[PDB]
Amino acid sequence: NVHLAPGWLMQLEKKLHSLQPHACFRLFLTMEINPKVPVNLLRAGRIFVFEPPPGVKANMLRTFSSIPVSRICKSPNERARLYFLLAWFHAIIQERLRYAPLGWSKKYEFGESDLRSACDTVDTWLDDTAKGRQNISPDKIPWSALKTLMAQSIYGGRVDNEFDQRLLNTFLERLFTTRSFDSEFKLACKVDGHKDIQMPDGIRREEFVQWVELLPDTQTPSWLGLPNNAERVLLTTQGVDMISKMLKMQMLAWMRTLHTTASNWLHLIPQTLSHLKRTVENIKDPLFRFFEREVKMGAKLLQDVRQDLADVVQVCEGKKKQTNYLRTLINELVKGILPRSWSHYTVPAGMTVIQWVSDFSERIKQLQNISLAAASGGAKELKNIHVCLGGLFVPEAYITATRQYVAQANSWSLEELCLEVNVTTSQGATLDACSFGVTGLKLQGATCNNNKLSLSNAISTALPLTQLRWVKQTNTEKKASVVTLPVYLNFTRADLIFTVDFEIATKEDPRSFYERGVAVLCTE
Amino acid sequence: PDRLLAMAHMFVSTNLGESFMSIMEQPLDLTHIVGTEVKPNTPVLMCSVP
Amino acid sequence: QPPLRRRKLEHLITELVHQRDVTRSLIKSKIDNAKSFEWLSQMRFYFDPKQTDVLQQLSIQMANAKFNYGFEYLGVQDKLVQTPLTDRCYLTMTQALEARLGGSPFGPAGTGKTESVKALGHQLGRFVLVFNCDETFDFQAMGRIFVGLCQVGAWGCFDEFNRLEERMLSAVSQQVQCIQEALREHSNPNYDKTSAPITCELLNKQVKVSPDMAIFITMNPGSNLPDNLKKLFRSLAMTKPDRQLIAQVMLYSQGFRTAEVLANKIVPFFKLCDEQLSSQSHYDFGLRALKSVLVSAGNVKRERIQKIKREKEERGEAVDEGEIAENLPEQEILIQSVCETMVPKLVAEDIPLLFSLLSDVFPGVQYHRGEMTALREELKKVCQEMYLTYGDGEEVGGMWVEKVLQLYQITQINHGLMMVGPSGSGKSMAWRVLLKALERLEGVEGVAHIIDPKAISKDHLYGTLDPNTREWTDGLFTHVLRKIIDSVRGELQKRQWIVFDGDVDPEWVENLNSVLDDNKLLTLPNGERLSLPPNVRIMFEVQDLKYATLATVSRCGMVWFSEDVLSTDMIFNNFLARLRSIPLDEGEDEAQRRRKGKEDEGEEAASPMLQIQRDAATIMQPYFTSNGLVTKALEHAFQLEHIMDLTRLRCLGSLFSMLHQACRNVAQYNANHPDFPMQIEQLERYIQRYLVYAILWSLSGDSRLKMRAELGEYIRRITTVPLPTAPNIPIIDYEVSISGEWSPWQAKVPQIEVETHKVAAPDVVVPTLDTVRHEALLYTWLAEHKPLVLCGPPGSGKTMTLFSALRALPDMEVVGLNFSSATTPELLLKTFDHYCEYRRTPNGVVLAPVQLGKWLVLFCDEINLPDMDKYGTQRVISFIRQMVEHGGFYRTSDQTWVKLERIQFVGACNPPTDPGRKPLSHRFLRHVPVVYVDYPGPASLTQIYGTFNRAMLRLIPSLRTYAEPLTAAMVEFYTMSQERFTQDTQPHYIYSPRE
Amino acid sequence: EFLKQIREVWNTYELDLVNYQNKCRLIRGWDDLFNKVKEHINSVSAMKLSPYYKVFEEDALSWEDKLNRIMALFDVWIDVQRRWVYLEGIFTGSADIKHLLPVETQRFQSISTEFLALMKKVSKSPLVMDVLNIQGVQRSLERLADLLGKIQKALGEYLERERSSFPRFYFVGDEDLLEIIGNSKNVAKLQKHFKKMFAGVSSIILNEDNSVVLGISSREGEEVMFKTPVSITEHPKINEWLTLVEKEMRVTLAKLLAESVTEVEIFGKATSIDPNTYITWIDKYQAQL
Amino acid sequence: VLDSGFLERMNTLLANGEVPGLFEGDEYATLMTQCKEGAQKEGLMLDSHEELYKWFTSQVIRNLHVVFTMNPSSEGLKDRAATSPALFNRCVLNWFGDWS
Ligand SMILES: Nc1ncnc2c1ncn2[C@@H]1O[C@H](COP(=O)(O)OP(=O)(O)OP(=O)(O)O)[C@@H](O)[C@H]1O
Ligand SMILES: Nc1ncnc2c1ncn2[C@@H]1O[C@H](COP(=O)(O)OP(=O)(O)O)[C@@H](O)[C@H]1O
Numbered sequence A: 001n002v003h004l005a006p007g008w009l010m011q012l013e014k015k016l017h018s019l020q021p022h023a024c025f026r027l028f029l030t031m032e033i034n035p036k037v038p039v040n041l042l043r044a045g046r047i048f049v050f051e052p053p054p055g056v057k058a059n060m061l062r063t064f065s066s067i068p069v070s071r072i073c074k075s076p077n078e079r080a081r082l083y084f085l086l087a088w089f090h091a092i093i094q095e096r097l098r099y100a101p102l103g104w105s106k107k108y109e110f111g112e113s114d115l116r117s118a119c120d121t122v123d124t125w126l127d128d129t130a131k132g133r134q135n136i137s138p139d140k141i142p143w144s145a146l147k148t149l150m151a152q153s154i155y156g157g158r159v160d161n162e163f164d165q166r167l168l169n170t171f172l173e174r175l176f177t178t179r180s181f182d183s184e185f186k187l188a189c190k191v192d193g194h195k196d197i198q199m200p201d202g203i204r205r206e207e208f209v210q211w212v213e214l215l216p217d218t219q220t221p222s223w224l225g226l227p228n229n230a231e232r233v234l235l236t237t238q239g240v241d242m243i244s245k246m247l248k249m250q251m252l253a254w255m256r257t258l259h260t261t262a263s264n265w266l267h268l269i270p271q272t273l274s275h276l277k278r279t280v281e282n283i284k285d286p287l288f289r290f291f292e293r294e295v296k297m298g299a300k301l302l303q304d305v306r307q308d309l310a311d312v313v314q315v316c317e318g319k320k321k322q323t324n325y326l327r328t329l330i331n332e333l334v335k336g337i338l339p340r341s342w343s344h345y346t347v348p349a350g351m352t353v354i355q356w357v358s359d360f361s362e363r364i365k366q367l368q369n370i371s372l373a374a375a376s377g378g379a380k381e382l383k384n385i386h387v388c389l390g391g392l393f394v395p396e397a398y399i400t401a402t403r404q405y406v407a408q409a410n411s412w413s414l415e416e417l418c419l420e421v422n423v424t425t426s427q428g429a430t431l432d433a434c435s436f437g438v439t440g441l442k443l444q445g446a447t448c449n450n451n452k453l454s455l456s457n458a459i460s461t462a463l464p465l466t467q468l469r470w471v472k473q474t475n476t477e478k479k480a481s482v483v484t485l486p487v488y489l490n491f492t493r494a495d496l497i498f499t500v501d502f503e504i505a506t507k508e509d510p511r512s513f514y515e516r517g518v519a520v521l522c523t524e
Numbered sequence B: 001p002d003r004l005l006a007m008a009h010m011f012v013s014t015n016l017g018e019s020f021m022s023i024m025e026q027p028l029d030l031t032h033i034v035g036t037e038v039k040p041n042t043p044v045l046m047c048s049v050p
Numbered sequence C: 001q002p003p004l005r006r007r008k009l010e011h012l013i014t015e016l017v018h019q020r021d022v023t024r025s026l027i028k029s030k031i032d033n034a035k036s037f038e039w040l041s042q043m044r045f046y047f048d049p050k051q052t053d054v055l056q057q058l059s060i061q062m063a064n065a066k067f068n069y070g071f072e073y074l075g076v077q078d079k080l081v082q083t084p085l086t087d088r089c090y091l092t093m094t095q096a097l098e099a100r101l102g103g104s105p106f107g108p109a110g111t112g113k114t115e116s117v118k119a120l121g122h123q124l125g126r127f128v129l130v131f132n133c134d135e136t137f138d139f140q141a142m143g144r145i146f147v148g149l150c151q152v153g154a155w156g157c158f159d160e161f162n163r164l165e166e167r168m169l170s171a172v173s174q175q176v177q178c179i180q181e182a183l184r185e186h187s188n189p190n191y192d193k194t195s196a197p198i199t200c201e202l203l204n205k206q207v208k209v210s211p212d213m214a215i216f217i218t219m220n221p222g223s224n225l226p227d228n229l230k231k232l233f234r235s236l237a238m239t240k241p242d243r244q245l246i247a248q249v250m251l252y253s254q255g256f257r258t259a260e261v262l263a264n265k266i267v268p269f270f271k272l273c274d275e276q277l278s279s280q281s282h283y284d285f286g287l288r289a290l291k292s293v294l295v296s297a298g299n300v301k302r303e304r305i306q307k308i309k310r311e312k313e314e315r316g317e318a319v320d321e322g323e324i325a326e327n328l329p330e331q332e333i334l335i336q337s338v339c340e341t342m343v344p345k346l347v348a349e350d351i352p353l354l355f356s357l358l359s360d361v362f363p364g365v366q367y368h369r370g371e372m373t374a375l376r377e378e379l380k381k382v383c384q385e386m387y388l389t390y391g392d393g394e395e396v397g398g399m400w401v402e403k404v405l406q407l408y409q410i411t412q413i414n415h416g417l418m419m420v421g422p423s424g425s426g427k428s429m430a431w432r433v434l435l436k437a438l439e440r441l442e443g444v445e446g447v448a449h450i451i452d453p454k455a456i457s458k459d460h461l462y463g464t465l466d467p468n469t470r471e472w473t474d475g476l477f478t479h480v481l482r483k484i485i486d487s488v489r490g491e492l493q494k495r496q497w498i499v500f501d502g503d504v505d506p507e508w509v510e511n512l513n514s515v516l517d518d519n520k521l522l523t524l525p526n527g528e529r530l531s532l533p534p535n536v537r538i539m540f541e542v543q544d545l546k547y548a549t550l551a552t553v554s555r556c557g558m559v560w561f562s563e564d565v566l567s568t569d570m571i572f573n574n575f576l577a578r579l580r581s582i583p584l585d586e587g588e589d590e591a592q593r594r595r596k597g598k599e600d601e602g603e604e605a606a607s608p609m610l611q612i613q614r615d616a617a618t619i620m621q622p623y624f625t626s627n628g629l630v631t632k633a634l635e636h637a638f639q640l641e642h643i644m645d646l647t648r649l650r651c652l653g654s655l656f657s658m659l660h661q662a663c664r665n666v667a668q669y670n671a672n673h674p675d676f677p678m679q680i681e682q683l684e685r686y687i688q689r690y691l692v693y694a695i696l697w698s699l700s701g702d703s704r705l706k707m708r709a710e711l712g713e714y715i716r717r718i719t720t721v722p723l724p725t726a727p728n729i730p731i732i733d734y735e736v737s738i739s740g741e742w743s744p745w746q747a748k749v750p751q752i753e754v755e756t757h758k759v760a761a762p763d764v765v766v767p768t769l770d771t772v773r774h775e776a777l778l779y780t781w782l783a784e785h786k787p788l789v790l791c792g793p794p795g796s797g798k799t800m801t802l803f804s805a806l807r808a809l810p811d812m813e814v815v816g817l818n819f820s821s822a823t824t825p826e827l828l829l830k831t832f833d834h835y836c837e838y839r840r841t842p843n844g845v846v847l848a849p850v851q852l853g854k855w856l857v858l859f860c861d862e863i864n865l866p867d868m869d870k871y872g873t874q875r876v877i878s879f880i881r882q883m884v885e886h887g888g889f890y891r892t893s894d895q896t897w898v899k900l901e902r903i904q905f906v907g908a909c910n911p912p913t914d915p916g917r918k919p920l921s922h923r924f925l926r927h928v929p930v931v932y933v934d935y936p937g938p939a940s941l942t943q944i945y946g947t948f949n950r951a952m953l954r955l956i957p958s959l960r961t962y963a964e965p966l967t968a969a970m971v972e973f974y975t976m977s978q979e980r981f982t983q984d985t986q987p988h989y990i991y992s993p994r995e
Numbered sequence D: 001e002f003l004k005q006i007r008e009v010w011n012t013y014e015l016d017l018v019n020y021q022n023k024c025r026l027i028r029g030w031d032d033l034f035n036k037v038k039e040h041i042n043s044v045s046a047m048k049l050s051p052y053y054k055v056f057e058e059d060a061l062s063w064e065d066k067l068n069r070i071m072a073l074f075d076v077w078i079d080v081q082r083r084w085v086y087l088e089g090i091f092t093g094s095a096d097i098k099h100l101l102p103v104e105t106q107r108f109q110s111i112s113t114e115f116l117a118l119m120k121k122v123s124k125s126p127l128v129m130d131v132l133n134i135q136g137v138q139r140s141l142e143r144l145a146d147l148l149g150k151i152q153k154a155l156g157e158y159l160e161r162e163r164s165s166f167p168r169f170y171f172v173g174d175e176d177l178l179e180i181i182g183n184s185k186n187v188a189k190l191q192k193h194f195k196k197m198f199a200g201v202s203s204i205i206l207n208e209d210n211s212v213v214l215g216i217s218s219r220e221g222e223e224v225m226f227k228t229p230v231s232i233t234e235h236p237k238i239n240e241w242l243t244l245v246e247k248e249m250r251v252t253l254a255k256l257l258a259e260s261v262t263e264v265e266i267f268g269k270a271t272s273i274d275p276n277t278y279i280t281w282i283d284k285y286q287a288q289l
Numbered sequence E: 001v002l003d004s005g006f007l008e009r010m011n012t013l014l015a016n017g018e019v020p021g022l023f024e025g026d027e028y029a030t031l032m033t034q035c036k037e038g039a040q041k042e043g044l045m046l047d048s049h050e051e052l053y054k055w056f057t058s059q060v061i062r063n064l065h066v067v068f069t070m071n072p073s074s075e076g077l078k079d080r081a082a083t084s085p086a087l088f089n090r091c092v093l094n095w096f097g098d099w100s
């Protein structure tokens, strides 16, 4: 663990430079990947990278080898199956970490420390309940204690997103149950549609290790509960990353290329944005206020971007001096890094300048259409315009504006409104006085028919025309066939905008919906 | 695009021989690398993913 | 109830609500066994008085962990609402403590991480210390504090560990790692519990670690825990507190019967205030703000109950507290509290947005503003006394009086407060009038101590201690505070307001944080602790809040004086009243007589100055109305582009001073024509003509020739007074003589013939149209003794013109000062103590020039050059702003006020577009007019130098015939050179007339 | 001329003697004098080069010896002055600091007498050269530096002992701890530090003559009365009666909690609680209890 | 010149012809003693330091030509203009770059 002292690492590198080593002498520095390590030490050594071998079977083997045999052999004998269940849960979450953000909304720090804490919890609670008896009934096992402790503190401590907590609760409630001691318990269902992994019938640590060693080496994401296309998504992400890395490598005269690129960008980006005319009647309407803020911000950003691009073109033409801001902008445009100045609205992480221009052109065109409709209709057309949630800079503000408009128009208070989502495939469907059209919403891992969800293996499905209706809050209990889907701003699933509800069709378990990572995306 | 990696493997095999990546698959052999090709003044940095 | 019993009742209600919720959950879940985990997860208490040791008498068990009460006296602390997230926090923290691991909650700010940890520590009765990890960090004392924690078994909670700088973070992390390894050594089952001398290496010595001690590290991602502490700390996610429950329980504890509906309304309303309202630094809409608003709403409800009870007791009916409580609108009380707390902090644009959101969330309810009739009457009297416009509600000046009332409320509530309105908004005119009205109402004399914080160094403000002899010197603020505290002249019986009137930056407010805090104490490097007297009110009149730390803003109340408060009609009325009342010929006399005269009866015709200026004001009254010529001209001129940023008050002050000079010229003509003083017709013609001339030279004085002509055409199109009838000459090129008619400036442009010698000498001021229009303007502005500022390209001879105009008066001695990036106010101090002496008048110390009867003018050559600090606010500019507005400055030795006498601060400038020229602050540009001295121009150059060429070629009698073609050729070539080599090609390609 | 300028600037150089609380005459201006010394030794050392150095070598060497002597003497002098100022502030800022440290106060007293004598002697002849020519001033000044350091260290050791004897003292700084341990008779001066050592304790309720600690008052005026008051007179040391106050606070809080629980058990086992009795119980006991 | 500390004094000397604050205290006294000597030695009989000091500056403006050598750098020239306008106002600038 030499990574803890970078300064001592510098000193050791200098000492190693100034020594007379014997032939048999050798220095072994074991460390973890951390930027704190000196470049000098890395330059003067033979680096060996030791990643953990991927696989559920490998994870179970590592967990079982780490835990001492005598600890598992402790009475009662149910402790062995408890430890196997905990190891399987740990393997499931750690392997699921790789497939992100579908499996986990963000990569959490699930490591050996959480496993050790969970093992200590299991030991203490089983010792408390059993009192030393050689065998105890599975009913008497404190399942609620284990589920609560590994959902709230042991494993859910690092979980911040509520939907990740819901997924973790579903995992714990599916695994940690008295039914897990039955000879026919299925750890994971629908591995390939037919085969299901079954619990080993043994009651000893040796039997569990033997079963782990006999796991087929044909792992697919369906083992973890994910759809079978998660592997394909990860593979295409890795391919794109490899292309980008090799392109950065191939980066190692450019005035003309930058000039023509900037000229193409300036031609592509629309020229002007017309601000909304603030009238006495218009200011009262919440939709007009929100759209005026949107067009003001869009026009400001558009003018800034256009002026910067014009100055870049002038510099590339050899006619303008390079200011420090201009020099930084030129460097970022050359390297392809998105400039920090053009980032007043949330964007996906690691998003190139070309994609930023492509998205900005669409946003500005949508805002131009919004402004034209507002000018022509005054205020009535703003309620009956189909606006993409991705196109707006702050979609949550749009949701709030729709809520305010409904509350003001229908004289209802703003705290007594609940959002009901209805998806219509008909083109130009008639909009109620309290319904607002929405386009561009993408459903991940599911298909909607007659406003009823169904599990699908497709990468994504585009909702034709989402309709947001605000209806007065009713104390009717939520049905068992209703699922709450998050609506993330982009595919990174880092920003949560709002949570719609949907109705499950036919016979599909909402637990599968929670585990499959089904969600709605404002933009794809 | 999901098979771009598996096809780049094939392209590398076509260009630089089939067994170009084969040695990487086999488990690392510390014996030869530590006995030879490492100078006694060269620290062996055995970095691992946290 | 008494406040202490009130807090006990609030704590009891807050705990009983959680107990009721837990009992309801137990009943619903059908829990039968006392060992069921649905019960074991709750914080349970077991009391055993039979135990001999008092520290082990009570056991607090929850889930697996079981602690003992430390029986530490915690006072009347702040119980938490016990939101379900705190439940998770308590469970995770107790699980971590039972596993001998410190807890590390993380999340955004305002979540309640430190409070949740501190409340857990207090629930177990354990002393808890919170180490703020901001810049106010005591590194040198942390080893001692950690040794104390180990020895006494008190808890330790850090606020934001990531805010630490890398070395300090690493050192504290190493200490925490050692301490936590020592703690983990307690958990070994094989360890002998009979003898457990667990030691930790702290301060290079062995310290015993008490088993009850614990360390919590609060993290704020956006980063993570240090690598060495990742394997020893249990992390918890405080991503979002349940604001709905936090409010509902508190409102139910405040007596509000409909607590649930009120909470479910107020929480989304605060979210909407955070989102929809314009982003401002001072807007605080966190859970802390909601908690306060709720407490204030409870106070308002109890005040209403007491008012109703007292009113019924005055009459003959009985009083039932429950009956009055039932018949009372809670939503109205909550909205009134929200408006009272949040309206002053809002900008003008956001107030309608706030009311729209309030109507959306709270439909059908309205906020009635609580008026103070006695203070409002006093406001009117003081406003009239100082020539101000007072208005009620929607009248002219209603917004300003509303702002003054909000200021009074904030003074009543807080001890330290800030007015952060933009330049020329009425901040000063507001607090002066409020102080005078309070003095006249309460009978307590009001005294203000305007202490500029940037004109002097931090050492000169707070005092410095001598490194060798350890002697303590009192700084300006410390001296003022000590003088107030001592109360040698009954200072405790007067209302002392320490107005700072200077921008706020995180250097000189660091020592003020303790004063603005609830401690109301000032800590000196000597060690003396100055307690803030109750009557002292620290007050900050700043322009913006771009460089102010959140601590100072949060510790102080604030009223935003938006620029829309001060309507131009109020300024016009102020100027008209001041002209009608205050004479201009008067100096020391007729000045204190205004204070001596409550009504000034019998002194209406005190001087022909007063009569003549009353006539002039009557003449210009129909032009200063709301929809007048001046207002439309100003509205059009704001659209125009000017050399410096335009402020309404700058143009208004310049115009007012030039009209004052017009009436003074009228008085001069009256004094030079005793037989026939000018009549009403001639006065009307002259005053209208000079008003047009003054608008032209005040609004467009900053801009160039083409846009001066644009404004002249606009005035000609919108005015009714007859103008010069010549076809193609700008109206700016015309002057107004004493007679009614105009007269072209060219009549005052003689073609002088310079002698052979001094053909190009510096003192050769060749009178030219520029040196005539600008000389007349500089005479007008210097007769008013204003800090005139001239701006233009370099070498334009601004100093020379300035010199040409100023040397015509045998009373002013120029002391040229050259400014640069290294200039400091100490340079001005040296100039003062060189050319002036500090005479001790009975009223106070006065700085005057040595030469009696002669006025001093301090030429500042390059006002823009002095470099802005890392937080802006050029120090010398701030000094000039203080000393030309507050009419004085504070000494750095005696710490007493110095009032200037016969000092003017005329200066030259370069345009801000030139490199290295830092733009001037509006707070200083407001007083100073700006004159745009551009390059002479082709015709002026042809004349200005033709004369020069004839004078030079007079030496050769035969070559004098080519003087005109030579000048034509020179002017042409100079123009081609100027239009050929621009500054874009090279930075030094500047072609001025000096060449 | 460079030699002559050195000679004149040093023969006319006078120390900046300054009043110090009317106690003695001290010295400021260390930066200027040290900078002058350093510049001059630099110049003389660099003078050893150049072909013209061969003349007036002995004068340069003697002058360099003079600069080295003054440099060492005043390098020790500045530290001695700083240490003596610090220790004089400590040993006269309290009355009991002499009682707690008899050997140390006596050592500093003897040092301060000798140092005041030396300061009077330099005040008689504030010239630099006359200062240098004092008989064995360097030996005495080094002795002062060594002895002063010993007292300062021993005093720090005593402070550490006092902190280790009462663990809560680690929460309060050095100067405030010195004030606490030194103002033992002025018990009313300790109330400003209780908010740092304890949690809610902002003062202590003293007796008529400040000889018995009756109880504790919190920050809000809320108070607790000790079941058995702690006697300052019986345990005059700050350590003893402070530890006794803490222990008595814990014991009294435990007993009051026991009584409050006894009452609230009767309160709970009822179907109708009289508001008067409940308010009386709430008023009787502390909020946390 | 790279240090900005000396540039203020150089600018003041270039513009005014004398830099205030350079001569103070006993240094000012010795300046006046040599100034007075020089004034009377030059035949400019003067005894009052206020008039005598003027004599000192009177000799300087006429007898001090400061020559600034600066490698060609557009950005550095712009910063020099930003920190000292007298270098392009009082100082006439001459350009000769690479030899032909
Ligand atoms: N009630 C009023 N009626 C008429 N004129 C008023 C009134 N209040 C203020 N004014 C005018 O507004 C001017 C500016 O107000 P004030 O002096 O308070 O500005 P300020 O806030 O101190 O400015 P800055 O922010 O630039 O320091 C006053 O000098 C006065 O001419
Ligand atoms: N359970 C709770 N009951 C009442 N107020 C709470 C609760 N939890 C947090 N708060 C309030 O939320 C705010 C959190 O501020 P604080 O805890 O000091 O900082 P941080 O959120 O950064 O840890 C405070 O106003 C605190 O009183």
Ligand SMILES: Nc1ncnc2c1ncn2[C@@H]1O[C@H](COP(=O)(O)OP(=O)(O)O)[C@@H](O)[C@H]1O
Pocket (backbone or CB within 6 Å): C761, C762, C763, C764, C765, C766, C767, C768, C771, C793, C794, C795, C796, C797, C798, C799, C800, C801, C908, C936, C944, C993, C994
């Ligand atoms: N009309 C004029 N009359 C007299 N001198 C003039 C006139 N126009 C230009 N000048 C000359 O132009 C030069 C301007 O120098 P200066 O006053 O230092 O410029 P600035 O004030 O812009 O720094 C002086 O030599 C001045 O005499």
